[PDB]
From Swiss-Prot:
The protein's name: Concanavalin-A
Species the sequence originates in: Canavalia ensiformis (Jack bean)
Record family assignment: Belongs to the leguminous lectin family.
Physiological role: D-mannose specific lectin. Displays antiviral activity and therefore may contribute to defense against infections.
Binding site for a carbohydrate: L99, Y100, D208, R228
Post-translational modification remark: The mature chain consists of residues 164-281 followed by 30-148. To form a mature chain the precursor undergoes further post-translational modification after removal of the signal sequence; cleavage after Asn at positions 148, 163, and 281 is followed by transposition and ligation (By formation of a new peptide bond) of residues 164-281 and 30-148. This maturation (circular permutation) relies on the legumain AEP1 activity and leads to an increased stability of conA after heat stress and at various pH.
Amino acid sequence: ADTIVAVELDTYPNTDIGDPSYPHIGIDIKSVRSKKTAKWNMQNGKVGTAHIIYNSVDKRLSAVVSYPNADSATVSYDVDLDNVLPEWVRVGLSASTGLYKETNTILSWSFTSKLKSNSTHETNALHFMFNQFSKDQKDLILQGDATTGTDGNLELTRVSSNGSPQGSSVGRALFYAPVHIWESSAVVASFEATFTFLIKSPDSHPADGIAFFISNIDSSIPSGSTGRLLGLFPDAN
Ligand SMILES: [Ca+2]
Ligand SMILES: [Mn+2]
């Protein structure tokens, strides 16, 4: 039922459902089997940054993930969102752990969406920016194990009192207000999202990953979407 478009920062290779045999970033359109991926040199314990951009002229969804003094990974894919998503959506962040685990900490998150229409200066826009999360962040819909407040961060998956990440966890945070992502009379529709994150794992193999996603407004975590399904899809098709 849920329509999902996501950019995944996939830390664990599940080669049987299509993942490359290394940590990677990917663009997922309605399926966990990324339409395109790029090798990603994940760094256990360092704060990374992801930038996701899209505009309706090029109809190109792109993403870059980087770490200070290190190389960035980028991946792009041609997609006409007007054909995939409803015109009103919610945007959010999702992460999970399964048999293997890692912390999926979000330090900041900002988003900007703009619809420049056939009337010019008749632009509708939405922008939000979180550099700190409060214990009671009322403008975020928290699903599953996601929580805020710990040192002003958003922990998408369960982390015990001493900081150890737990397995079999899934959590998502969606911005409260629906977002008008496209409208047919719009000359140019575009958006940009940025978030900083901290993935740490005591394990040799961290899992499962973090994703930025856009979905139908009433999207909820699909049953059994812990692990490789990243809290976004009901199965691996
Ligand atoms: Ca994976
Ligand atoms: Mn993947």
